[PDB]
Ligand binder design. Structure first.
Ligand SMILES: [Mg+2]
Ligand SMILES: [Mg+2]
Ligand SMILES: [Mg+2]
Lengths: 323, 323, 323
């Protein structure tokens, strides 16, 4: 009877979140010791439950279908784990991925580098895609209000500049979705501009989610699907530059009182990444379901280890005071 | 076999108490990891096991029935969880609620605001209701002595002034119920006078129980059953005024060496309230049975988190000493 | 010839304001040495000059009558004592008191506790009563502009939360009534939330008016018309909790540069309350007309006494510097 084994799992100061892409998979992982969904991917919902470009649906006057499918998926995930928070990520599609949707060829220009192209918040605040972002915000508002699921938060993927973030925030406010005590807004820390200006971005969002997969790619300026670059071992999240960027993000966000989360494959595979993150004082770690329990163990041990080490340092520090 | 799973639950520095209103429900929740009954409501016993106003029973010479029913309920609850403490709350009825009892129309005046009317300690020390309070104290004494259940403590609901508290204490002493090492007396911190003078009230009671439901109502001056006020969102226990009052109560009580408890719906629904309470250093948290286990998890995690944060602060503090 | 005796009255640092409920009574008390009307009650105007619920008049399209009667009363009071300020209090009625008006049964729900019910700013910002508050603001604007009576200020009764105060302020701004150098906005400090967060409320208002009558009731959680509670002596404004709350309000408001006033029966009857208020450094005291002159004497003496005591302390303090 595993359902009574949940409270007996090790207690961790750092929150252990879970990454979810398919809403129907929430019932498979309902017995895992996770403190919430730190990353809900709505890409699967749009691809397989909608099949249509949101702008195409707006042109055909079918906003209701898109809004209702997103609302159904998000409400299922939120109600399955209430009151644990569900951090829904906005549309993370690229232009080429957007073209895969039905009727998306008319609204998606052919881009040489969609990886660093028109995507994320830059797409949301643009007048062309603004109605689709408004549809997504309307779905989130319907989940939070019609179903009363307060535990639904949002994260803005691929945030580039502060003014774009504030424009997205005011667009959300125009839709009645306002940042508050019961509503948290996060920003993906996958762009080096966020690394350099995390303390400046913290005035607009409640916290940051470090997209280590994309953050490593952008910091190193390398793209993963290129087999040549992958063979050389570039895409190691243990890279000193990536670690320095993560440390800077954590320091700036905690100096401005913003929470820091990480949602990538780095904590799932590399224990040393987890140790470094916990030592830096990261607020939460979001991992894949199959890596939840182990992470909950590992973080706990690391915390205990830290709780020893700091004590020693304090004593040593105290020694230098008396001499 | 859940009965051997009790010792395996997470260990929390803050005591996790349980709220009980029906004595017969103690057997349903005997397998929950609670450190005691932080709030036992005798309102159900008087309403459904007595059906009669205590003053009416005194007039009819039936004090024995009221005393014996209270003693039976309290003894059942205390013996079910011995030696864990059972904090019995005295009669928390309002005048309109008192009139619901049989024969209570003759003893309860019609009040415009019973919510802030003749209730609580103000009712107990009044000569008219003093015999009923003496009956309640006699029932408590019978439980503590005839059945030898030392684990029964009392809390005074809706305490307004220090002189009324000392008059209630001397009335209890006249009945042979004296505050001591084996008997704890608490005061409900649901009136702003307790907020302002907690350090003064601490000389009379062993600890305080924060009635967050009533404390929010009195601090904000709003009454919950009014749907208009509820719709505007006034009754949020995360309100800055309520948090400041709770912090002041905790600080004053710990400055005077008195324990602090909370028995309301705030810790059951809002994790941030629990985090703030544990950070402030609250001695115990009393929640509903269905919210016990989760709270025991949450508090534990928060404690661990705090146990990290303080360490960091100490190191930072130590840094400022060397420079 | 008493009219030349006004300048010969004792000079007080603390402003001595007067409480007025009937505009026609301003001519009776025009020869009293008061520095202004610290509390103008428009309850009498609405009850006896309008007789109608403002929402009922709006439904019947008779906003002009209500606005003109309020304007006539306020203009009479302001012109009678120009340029001394007239602090008009907004509608302080309760729901039961509102039902006494003609046609008010349809707009006032039956409330169990109107004393802590839908009243004050909570009523003004609500969409249902918002047109009536707009009518009151329009009357104030007509007095300040059509008659050019700059000396008219407003106070918001029964302020609960900061967001409600800012919503009322923006509603006033939408009506052209904006806080400025020639227009002062006060908040009644009769709710314990104001006591706990006076420094936070000071960013929205020019000053605070301590409603000691209601402040004592809310701090002690007792209602005055209950004869049982009154007999026990609960409603003593010399209570330590009420004094501590008043001291906290004064300290916070003066730390944020906001003026503090008191408009209640405490300074009219208890000289020690006046002494404590003047020692705390209250900016003004508003009393009943029959208690004006005596208060003007008493405060003066107290000020002189303080002006001695502080000097002694300074000398003593200086002694500790030389030793
Ligand atoms: Mg990404
Ligand atoms: Mg209560
Ligand atoms: Mg009042």
């Amino acid at each position: 009877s595993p359902e009574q084994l949940l409270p007996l799992y090790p207690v961790t100061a750092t929150k252990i979140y879970m990454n979810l892409g398919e809403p129907d998979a929430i019932e498979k992982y309902k017995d895992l010791p996770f403190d919430g969904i730190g990353l809900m991917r709505i890409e699967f919902i749009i691809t397989d439950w909608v099949q249509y470009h949101p702008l195409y649906l707006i042109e055909q006057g079918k906003e209701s279908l898109f809004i209702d499918k997103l609302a159904e998926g998000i409400a299922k995930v939120a109600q399955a784990i209430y009151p644990r928070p569900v951090v829904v990520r906005f549309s993370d599609f690229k232009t080429n991925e957007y073209r895969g949707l039905k009727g998306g060829e008319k609204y998606e220009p052919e881009e040489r580098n969609p990886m660093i192209g028109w995507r994320g918040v830059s797409r949301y605040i643009h007048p062309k895609y603004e109605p689709a972002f408004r549809l997504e915000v309307r779905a989130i508002k319907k989940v939070r209000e019609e179903m009363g699921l307060t535990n639904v938060w949002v994260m803005f993927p691929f945030v580039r500049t502060t003014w774009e973030l504030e424009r997205a925030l005011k667009i959300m406010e125009e839709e009645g979705l306002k940042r508050g005590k019961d509503f948290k807004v996060w920003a993906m820390a996958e762009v080096p501009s966020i690394v350099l200006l995390a303390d400046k971005f913290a005035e607009y969002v409640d916290g940051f989610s470090i997209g280590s997969n994309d953050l490593t790619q952008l910091i190193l300026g390398a793209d993963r699907d290129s087999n040549i670059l992958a063979e050389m071992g570039y895409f190691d999240e243990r890279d000193p530059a990536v670690l320095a960027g993560i440390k800077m993000i954590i320091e700036k966000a905690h100096s401005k009182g913003a929470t820091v989360s990480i949602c990538g494959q780095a904590p799932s595979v590399y224990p040393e990444i987890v140790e470094f993150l916990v030592e830096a004082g990261i607020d939460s770690i979001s991992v894949n379901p199959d890596a939840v329990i182990a992470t909950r163990r590992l973080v706990a041990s690391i915390e205990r280890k830290i709780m020893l080490k700091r004590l020693n340092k304090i004593m040593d520090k105290l020694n230098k005071l008396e001499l």
